[PDB]
Design a protein around this ligand. Structure first.
Ligand SMILES: O=C(CCCCCCC(O)(O)C(F)(F)F)Nc1ccccc1
Ligand SMILES: O=C(CCCCCCC(O)(O)C(F)(F)F)Nc1ccccc1
Ligand SMILES: O=C(CCCCCCC(O)(O)C(F)(F)F)Nc1ccccc1
Ligand SMILES: O=C(CCCCCCC(O)(O)C(F)(F)F)Nc1ccccc1
Ligand SMILES: [K+]
Ligand SMILES: [K+]
Ligand SMILES: [K+]
Ligand SMILES: [K+]
Ligand SMILES: [K+]
Ligand SMILES: [K+]
Ligand SMILES: [K+]
Ligand SMILES: [K+]
Ligand SMILES: [Zn+2]
Ligand SMILES: [Zn+2]
Ligand SMILES: [Zn+2]
Ligand SMILES: [Zn+2]
Lengths: 368, 369, 369, 368
């Protein structure tokens, strides 16, 4: 039984009238209808899940708002209180860093996003469901313990892992983040903690600018339980699948988590504006198949996918649908971009890609 | 014969936000939307049609020049100007006063260019360099009274232009004719006590503002008799508007003998506008413009300046505006492609209630000395 | 008490092209635009508000089932059905007949789901599984006559539903009440000779179609007297619409004693609609729905099915639709955030011309046997 | 004196309701407001030229519709007649290959696009202007002699080169195409002809799928007078500037054209969805500066830029503005994305990038 979370308000996140930062007349950044992170991209994924007929093979799960207690398992009280404050401003406002704003009442949506991840986690962990996909928005993985960053208000996968640890009593949880940007927030939250293995595959130095190096390995008892796999621009299906086979799956098998949470972004796709990677829907399909099969082998199938980034309203729906189909086992729609993208490359493992991945292999032995 | 035309790229860059009218609001469940009712694309589509139709070849482009503080202070209070500076300097922009309409960051630059476009065109018509013109400005003006912003308006563009004509050009009498479908309350307020600017507003009765635009609002002191409101009922169309022109507006202008006529030219009385219930077609606006231009020829050596006010149909407004431009250039080269569709809907018969609304104003003409 | 609700994702995927009303056309200088007047976002925003408001929790979701050829042929000719198959099979889609409205490629799938959503809801209300419901379908129906598509409509959804109630459920009398602001010419045509479906249309006089909807259009043969048009003047608001309900519509339904009432529920009579000139507010639609639901309770065991027709304000339509949903669920949990803004504009006084238009229809009630 | 062409109708090109191909319900490709190639991207470039104040330093040049005779210098009569036919269809239609459609009356815009390139070429070549930028749409470089392809109806730069050859009597013209996709159309048109040197820098096998190899060198008298520089995905400023210095500028100096036409796309930008390259506005600035200075040295400054592709409505305006500023010499606006993008990389010449460029150096000796 496969759970699926969508909430209407995920599609109502107010991203403003700028492109990335706000529109700014002095800088001559003209207003635009769709910010890069506009919610339509993820809503189109949801609408494809429905229109394709996948929804008939899924068990819809209503999001339940994350409580203050839920949020405080991942974040500081000061951060939570600041998000309450900003959300109460009549226009919304600056969430801290001056780039990403939050719209008025936006905390309601941020709680439903974290809460959708928690609710799905609860149902999968207790055995009500075998697995699922939480198509949440706003995203999570850049928000560290004490701040919002990178379009993220709360770290949804960390709120879910915190819940699995504290409420469900799991001793080991893994978060695998294949969003193309470094999961700095998740890395920060669990830095000193070996009970949550944090893995991030990402384009090297894409975002944030100063993080995601292979030398960032945790601290204290957590040393060895953070794994970064920075990959070069232009990496495609061959690099990603080699990273899965050489690093990710062996790390999960070594760690023996009781639950795998996937921070599932699709911004590594061939058509994404916010990175330079070459993954196709078939690549994401294979990544999901491998991870689901790994869960079947090591943690009784307990795997929860939670939406992170992705910025192609054209193509992201088909990348997401491929993952859904691997969960349901019903493979009923082709990728209509397949012919167009398959000739572009990414399907050969380049020497620089291989080398980037091999850098991480000696770190596997420190996962006890 | 030389017809001025003002468009500035930044008129198309006004940031109207992500709400419909007020801001988006999650608790109220007002979902964000790409195009606010007042989004600048409507007016930009008008500009683009002026160009694509070939009308631009018959126009003399006139660059907007930013309105100075001194220009603005002829229509507005120092406190209002300072408040607009303050709001424009806020990092996200903010509330211009009424709680509904926001102004984006640095937006004062565009407000100055909008008012300044009206001033520049007025200057160049009044000297005789140009015979007439159209200033396709944004943001609009006619709701902003002396001491505030209101109704999407930051500065009262036509009043800044009239103030310039009075103080800098020394004209003794100026008329502002406002056929935007909403009451020109701002213009009325600014010149309330002043007989040297005749203010006329045709509008849908109580459309916006809610408490405003009655025929009993006639000015005060020396200005008593030099404000004329013509409130019309919902559903009024070409017949009503042309009867109002013939019975009230043109006689008022002839009685007053302005040295310059400024037209607050909105197209929100159109048959397809969401923000009013009127039935005017492009041919109606054409006839309104022709009548007014011919009146200017008769009484003030042709000195007429059109200044864009409202209008909210991105589909149809361009053709209403193009009709007015064609009356200025005398080059009538494109049909209204909506003509057949709209002509059958009505508005072309003068209804008794429409006639009566207009006749209410006729006895006030005698007080225009 | 169980209230059915139909939404299908594909209702939001109807491809309305890149024109405003007709296609974009370069020679005519009709610039392309992102949102056609009839773009599906308007109705999708209604659905999203039903969900976000929490109304969805009080509704029983009912899946659309594609209308079969047999379902469609109860309302339409075989030639019409075959033509829609043909057009839907063209690689880009194409002209559905009138030259204005296009249908996108594969669009027949959505037309079948739209009609089928109405049928499914009708079936489940008529059995007593549900007490009532709202089918938020798209594309709309009421302009499509027996032999053609027209006015954005491919199949006449409410007539497909009525045909099902008559032929499959064996109901002897069905009523279709159409308060979309445009004349239900299609529905009128289909049931013209047939007294077993009472067809009532309230509409702005001659809004669309242009030659249609007069009070003299009363049916023919055995159907004479079982079509009722109530043309209303531009500018009519809540007072007119509620007077029409009380003087004409409700008495007609009580005289006829239908076994099921189907409401063609458009919201294009709203105060903010671009495609008509009426002044109805969400509170007006609320009162219209309440009256009709209470009438159904009195005369046909509550069997009432609402089926979405038109409406073109993405800003305001959601709140008009939500008011109707709240009358069905009895859960009144969200204000209309436009109430203050619109309440001052008028429409709340019954004008003499509005009263007279309605009184024209009262003598026709006696012919409903 | 710097010429600048914009025509309102360049912004009115009807790209439909699909993403790339048409919307298609059976494939579950949901309609969308903005096709990848929607004209707003280029219109935003024009509006920035105006709002930045660059327009005050430019001489606006009205487009003049390309005549049949103009078009026939680059294309077959059958192609021209087919475009007339498709343009006359009530909805427009299929321009030949089934992917890119042309809207009704669209031939008018295609003539104004080619004609804008011709008119600017005429004024620069005759000495009325020193240089200029024709911000045209639809684009040109994929249209070969006998067909439309890749959003291109007519090959604008080839129509302009044909005019320079036949009407102005220039013996040698060069077309340098730095659009990220291979200029297959331009390559095809001048394949057998040494009097037009055709150079294309591009992402290897991005589009079209089967072309742009270094082995495509022309034929007959034209052998040696087509130069392809395929570059790997992820190439940025360092690779592009190395290609300019090692291949492009030496090729131009060897050839001694009497006019340089630049097919100026910005789809190699860091934020483009339709390629995987890493060029920033400063990169395009340096490319333009180098090419303009080369023209000053070898052909009395006669250089004409003609817009090709580019698909970031956010960033393309700033890339285009950088080129305009190099033409006017007035450098009055910062790139507001500079900090955000500068940390992402592309500024180091990688071994695979260097090698790709060095593959072309031995071909320079065959340019006589
Ligand atoms: O703002 C940014 C880039 C933001 C990119 C966010 C990606 C978010 C995400 O997809 O991973 C996800 F979280 F949505 F998943 N950088 C700056 C800003 C200022 C100065 C330097 C760099
Ligand atoms: O906000 C509005 C409606 C605003 C309509 C502005 C029309 C502007 C204009 O076209 O005339 C022009 F100025 F642009 F020209 N009403 C309220 C708000 C609160 C309470 C009651 C009514
Ligand atoms: O095309 C139109 C107007 C179309 C308006 C359709 C309204 C559709 C609807 O809301 O009722 C509903 F069906 F969607 F519900 N008129 C012409 C065209 C040619 C000649 C004269 C008039
Ligand atoms: O349609 C495409 C990709 C089109 C990309 C066009 C780029 C155009 C351009 O920017 O260079 C410029 F010309 F605009 F400049 N490929 C297919 C389609 C079907 C099957 C395989 C591949
Ligand atoms: K850890
Ligand atoms: K990651
Ligand atoms: K006055
Ligand atoms: K007015
Ligand atoms: K009947
Ligand atoms: K009706
Ligand atoms: K050649
Ligand atoms: K190229
Ligand atoms: Zn990301
Ligand atoms: Zn107005
Ligand atoms: Zn309607
Ligand atoms: Zn390109």
């Amino acid at each position: 039984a496969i759970g699926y979370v969508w909430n209407t308000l995920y599609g109502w996140v107010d991203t403003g009238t700028g492109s990335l930062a706000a529109a700014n007349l002095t800088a001559r950044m003209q207003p635009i209808s769709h910010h890069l992170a506009h919610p339509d991209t993820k809503r189109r994924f949801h609408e494809l899940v429905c229109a394709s007929g996948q929804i008939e093979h899924l068990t819809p799960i209503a999001a339940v708002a994350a409580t203050d207690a839920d949020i405080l398992r991942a974040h500081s009280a000061a951060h939570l209180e600041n998000m309450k404050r900003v959300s109460n401003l009549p226009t919304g406002g600056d969430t801290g860093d001056g780039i990403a704003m939050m719209g008025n009442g936006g905390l309601e949506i941020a709680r439903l996003s974290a809460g959708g991840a928690v609710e799905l986690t609860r149902r999968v962990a207790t055995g009500e469901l075998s697995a699922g996909y939480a198509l949440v928005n706003p995203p999570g993985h850049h928000a560290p313990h004490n701040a919002a960053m990178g379009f993220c208000i709360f770290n949804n996968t960390s709120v879910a892992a915190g819940y699995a640890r504290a409420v469900l009593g799991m001793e080991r949880v893994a978060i695998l983040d294949w969003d193309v940007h470094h999961g700095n927030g998740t890395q920060d939250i669990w830095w000193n903690d070996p009970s949550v293995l944090t893995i991030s595959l990402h384009q090297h130095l894409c975002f944030p600018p100063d993080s995601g190096y292979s030398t960032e390995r945790g601290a204290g008892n957590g040393h060895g339980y953070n794994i970064n796999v920075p990959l070069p621009p232009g990496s495609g299906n061959a690099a990603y699948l080699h990273a899965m086979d050489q690093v990710v799956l062996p790390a999960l098998r070594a760690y023996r988590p009781q639950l795998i949470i996937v921070g599932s972004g699709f911004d590594a796709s061939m058509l994404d504006p916010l990175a330079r990677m070459m993954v196709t829907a078939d690549g994401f399909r294979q990544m999901a198949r491998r991870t689901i099969d790994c869960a079947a082998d090591i943690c009784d199938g307990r795997i929860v996918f939670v939406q992170e980034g992705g910025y192609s309203p054209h193509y992201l729906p088909f990348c997401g649908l491929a993952v859904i189909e691997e969960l349901t086992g019903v493979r009923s729609l082709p990728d209509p971009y397949h012919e167009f993208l398959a000739g572009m490359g990414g399907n050969t493992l380049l020497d620089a890609e291989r080398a980037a991945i091999e850098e991480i292999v000696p770190l596997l032995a420190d996962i006890r």
